[PDB]
Amino acid sequence: KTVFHLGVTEADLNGATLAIIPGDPARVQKIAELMDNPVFLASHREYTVYRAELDGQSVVVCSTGIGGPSTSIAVEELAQLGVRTFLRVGTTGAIQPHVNVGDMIVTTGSVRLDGASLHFAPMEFPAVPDFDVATAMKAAAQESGATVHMGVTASSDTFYPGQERYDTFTGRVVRRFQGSMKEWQDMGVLNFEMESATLLTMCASSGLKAGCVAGVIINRTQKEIPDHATLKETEARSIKVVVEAARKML
Amino acid sequence: TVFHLGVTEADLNGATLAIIPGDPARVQKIAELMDNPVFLASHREYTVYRAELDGQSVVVCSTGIGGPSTSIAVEELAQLGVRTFLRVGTTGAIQPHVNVGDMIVTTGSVRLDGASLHFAPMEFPAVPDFDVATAMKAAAQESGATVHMGVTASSDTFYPGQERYDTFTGRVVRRFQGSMKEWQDMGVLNFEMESATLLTMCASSGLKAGCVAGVIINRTQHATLKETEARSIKVVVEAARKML
Ligand SMILES: O=c1cc[nH]c(=O)[nH]1
């Protein structure tokens, strides 16, 4: 049948029960082309949807847009169409000293600084990935030859104050988030991003398997600026890792 | 040059007012309603046009879905000198008396989002600037449409936070069980997904903002839709005129 936002049907998916879900529509086709017989399905707003084949099995690639709210729509609609496993892939900025540009982060849990996660489970509930998925992700990341870090990611509804940035129009951060950056750093949190709490919470409380893997393209604590080569490799590595992780899941 | 929108202060040609629809696909149509529309940039869900309205530079910029993507657009536009933000959209009503085709101008939003808490504590009201609300009401009335001023419920999800049960799991978390009836009985007009974030971040940061929406469906009960779509963008451009 046709879902309201993604504009595809269950038949369109060709029995796919796994989706790779990047944030940016413009990464979708690039991820699908690492696989076999990529076919464009639809593009509405931030949702660009392709199907492809991995080891003879149908797999969907669907962008989610920025933030938990746009993500919750994509996940819910893919679930209605029979998708049961969701592999988030991305790039990110680290906030710990020992984490280098080019390294991979597999999320073991997210700090829920979002709003959408609360629409699925109360705050007490752990925003945790599915164990098989994190396990498949770790393995695929290790095999890429990159250094892999397992740990907690802080997941914010904003890019600016929720990540305690002061280089902004007002130069001000609301009380709740003042000092929060140092707080996460001291608690061992690895990186910030903006969709994982919502994805992990909704899936963990709804019988869907999910997980997040991200290549580090910047370390926010270091002045040294990464060269373009290292960045291109990292983006390339990120998406090969998630496809290889998808392979392990099948 | 701002990080997500990819435009500079110079690109805006002095604009201090932006019209901010959700969908990138609507940005060009809105800009062409005015004079000398010019493409500025497109990156992810952010398509940015500039235009001129009664001799003044105006920006049109999509925000994508949800409070988080909106928060980025608004902040970067503000860094570029933008002080007034006119949100236009279409929406689904939850009051039986509100008709497909009517306009709703939000007078406050129930904060069922998350991003608003990144700007002000929950006690802070998600309320439009009074001049913008006034411009919006006047412009809506001039369109011949029936206009409702009222409270909007602004949710971070489309499904459980708007108490939809027609879903994969068929469950709605305890916080939102019975919430639709609750909002109805308190006279809330409609649901949408960005207004709480937009209104809180602007009201708490010295920016003027408001929301107007055409009603395209009713939760309680074509292409009348296309007529409403078109009317809604005519309404927001006229409201812009009144603000300038
Ligand atoms: O019910 C609706 C209809 C349109 N948009 C929403 O956010 N909710």
B92 CB under 6 A from ligand 1?
A: yes
Tell me how far the alpha carbon of residue A114 lies from the centroid of ligand 1, in angstroms: 20
Q: Which fold has domain B1-244?
A: Rossmann fold (3.40.50)
Are the beta carbons of A191 and A214 closer than 8 angstroms? yes
Considering CB atoms only, which of A24, A65, A120 is closest to B65? A65
A115 to chain B: which residues are within 8 Å by CB?
A: 67, 112-115, 117, 156
Minimal CA–CA distance to A101: which of A207, A15, A214?
A214
Q: CA-CA distance, B59 to B78, in Å (whole number)?
A: 12
Q: Where do runs of H (alpha helix) occur along B33-168? A: 67-79, 130-142
Considering CB atoms only, which of B155, B168, B193 is closest to A80? B168
Considering CB atoms only, which of A46, A79, A116 is closest to B64? A46
Residue type, B177: Q
> Are B65 and A73 in contact (CB < 8 Å)?
yes
Interface of A with B in 209-248 (CB under 8 A): none
Are the beta carbons of A46 and B64 closer than 8 angstroms? yes
Token pair recorded at residue A59: 């797999």
DSSP secondary structure of B18-67: EE--S-GGGHHHHHHTSEEEEEEEEETTEEEEEEEETTEEEEEE---SSH
> Are B175 and A119 in contact (CB < 8 Å)?
yes
Residue type, B122: M
Q: CA-CA distance, A201 to A6, in Å (whole number)?
A: 21
Element (H, E) at A192: strand A191-193
Would you put residue B36 in left (φ > 0), alpha (ψ -120 to 50) or beta? left
Are the beta carbons of A113 and A154 closer than 8 angstroms? yes
How crowded is the C-beta side of A133, counted as CA atoms within 13 Å?
A: 27
Residue of B63, B154, B191 with the most ligand 1 atoms within 8 Å of its CB, for mutation:
B191
DSSP secondary structure of A30-53: HHHTTSEEEEEEEEETTEEEEEEE
- Taking only Cα atoms into account, the Rg of chain A, rounded to an integer number of angstroms, comes to 17
**For chain B, which residues make up each domain, given as ranges?**
1-244
Are the beta carbons of A94 and A215 closer than 8 angstroms? no
> Residue A67 gets which letter from DSSP?
S
Instruction: Give the SS3 label for residue A249.
Output: helix
> Are B167 and A72 in contact (CB < 8 Å)?
no
For chain A, what's the residue count?
A: 250
Residue type, B200: T
> Are A161 and B23 in contact (CB < 8 Å)?
no
Are the beta carbons of B100 and B148 closer than 8 angstroms? no
Q: CA-CA distance, B31 to B37, in Å (whole number)?
A: 5
Q: Where do runs of H (alpha helix) occur along chain A? A: 10-13, 25-32, 68-80, 131-143, 180-186, 196-204, 228-249
Question: What are the residues whose beta carbons fall under 8 Å from the beta carbon of B163, sequence distance 6 or more?
Answer: B172, B176, B177, B178, B179, B180
**CA distance, residue A161 to nearest chain B CA (Å):** 6
Handedness of CA B72, B75, B80, B82 (dihedral sign): positive
For chain B, what's the residue count?
A: 244
Would you put residue A107 in left (φ > 0), alpha (ψ -120 to 50) or beta? beta
The CATH class of A1-250 is alpha beta
Residue A223: count other Cβ atoms within 10 Å of its Cβ.
Answer: 5
Minimal CA–CA distance to A42: which of A54, A53, A28?
A28
Interchain contact A24–B (C-beta under 8 A)? yes
Phi, psi torsion values for B56, nearest 5 degrees: -115, 140
Greatest alpha-carbon pair distance for chain A in Å reads: 53
Atom 2 of ligand 1: nearest residue by CA position: B92
Element (H, E) at A57: strand A57-62
Resolution to 1 decimal place, in Å: 2.0
